Design a protein around this ligand. Structure first.
Ligand code: HEM
Ligand SMILES: [Ca+2]
Ligand SMILES: [Ca+2]
Length: 345
């Protein structure tokens, strides 16, 4: 343990340089510490860097990808052209100059920016940050990042190969869709959120994906898109099916009205994702650099039905426990506002 020049204690004096990186990204990437487009894009970038590993491919003498190696940045012209990585070159290009200026590894930076991004979102867990990711030497193969039109079987199998993650852990990692929008699936409109609170790390994603889908927020006929339950909200087929599948439905529902489980499980699974490709015992704990997460503001219940929705609108899929009869916000059904992204998204 060491004390940095700012008086903060950290796991190791090598962590102290990350306070310079923190100040720089908070002002110049996240527009003063916001949980907006760049924050959401950085959270997604962690998954797409890290899940690109495959012990199964390696066991046939094929490169399976290095996991959290910064390969999606170092080899951006290759990986960001893969279909599942659509729209990520925009955030890669915004991140690159910080990596160059601060002399940090591309994989460490991607993990850092994802943790800082989440710390900006009220309700987020206290996010971890470990260092020790050598620069990738090969780009990832394609076919390693899940698609919204993939089956539940293949997504379960994919995350079990990548990280020995089981079907329950697949549900936890999809909590990231609580602070997320879709730029590229609907060719007519960018920035359609997955839940009605894309600035808030909460279980609205788990509530709202359980509702009956009533309309497309924009165009119909988009591969891997299904009807959503609110105007301005997007829903993808993978989320819709995982929420109703007999293996995962009860786990999905368990996050409704359970902030502690949402926060504790996502803290765990995020750190696990950021260690793919690495020996955790070789890494340095710089978690004390990450800002203290903020609580959800206001005095409303943690989970709620959006205005215009009640228990009658829930497609209850959990045979163990009934979907909880939440409160319904007052007034007319309200449109979820789009989050316009930076150019090239
Ligand atoms: C496992 C199956 C998953 C599928 C099929 C999936 C699919 C999607 C799709 C289709 C989008 C919109 C992408 C675009 O339009 O460019 C998206 C956005 C996003 N995903 Fe996922 N995802 C998955 C898992 C995860 C995980 C595990 C995380 C993070 C831990 C994550 C974080 C995000 C975030 C933050 C966004 C929003 C990006 C933005 O606001 O620009 N996703 N996801
Ligand atoms: Ca990678
Ligand atoms: Ca949310």
């Amino acid at each position: 343990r060491a004390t940095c020049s700012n008086g903060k204690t950290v796991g190791d004096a090598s962590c102290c340089a990350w306070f310079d990186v923190l100040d720089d990204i908070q002002q110049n990437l996240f527009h003063g510490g916001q949980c907006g487009a760049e924050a959401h894009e950085s959270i997604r970038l962690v998954f797409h860097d890290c899940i690109a590993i495959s012990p199964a491919m390696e066991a046939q003498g094929k490169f399976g990808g290095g996991g959290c190696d910064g390969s999606i940045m170092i080899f951006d012209d290759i990986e960001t052209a893969f279909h599942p990585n659509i729209g990520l070159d925009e955030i890669v290009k915004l991140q690159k100059p910080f990596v160059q200026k601060h002399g940090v590894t591309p994989g460490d930076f991607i993990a850092f920016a994802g943790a800082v991004a989440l710390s900006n979102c009220p309700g987020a867990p206290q996010m971890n940050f470990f260092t020790g990711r050598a620069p990738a030497t090969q780009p990832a193969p394609d076919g390693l990042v899940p698609e919204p039109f993939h089956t539940v079987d293949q997504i379960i199998n994919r995350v079990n190969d990548a990280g020995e993650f089981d079907e329950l852990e697949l549900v936890w990692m999809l909590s990231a869709h609580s602070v997320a929008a879709v730029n590229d699936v609907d060719p007519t409109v960018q920035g359609l959120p997955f839940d009605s609170t894309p600035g808030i790390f909460d279980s609205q994603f788990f509530v709202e994906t359980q509702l009956r889908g009533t309309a497309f927020p924009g165009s119909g006929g988009n591969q891997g898109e299904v009807e959503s339950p609110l105007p301005g909200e997007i829903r993808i087929q993978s989320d819709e099916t995982i929420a109703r599948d007999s293996r995962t439905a009860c786990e999905w529902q368990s996050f409704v009205n359970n902030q502690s489980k949402l926060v504790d499980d996502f803290q765990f699974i995020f750190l696990a994702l950021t260690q793919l490709g690495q020996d955790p015992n070789a890494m340095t704990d710089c978690s004390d650099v990450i800002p203290q997460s903020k609580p959800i503001p206001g005095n409303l219940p943690f989970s709620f039905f959006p205005a215009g929705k009640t228990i009658k609108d829930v497609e209850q899929a959990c045979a163990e426990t009934p979907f909880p009869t939440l409160t319904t916000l007052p007034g007319p059904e309200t449109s979820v506002q789009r989050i316009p992204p930076p150019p090239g998204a």
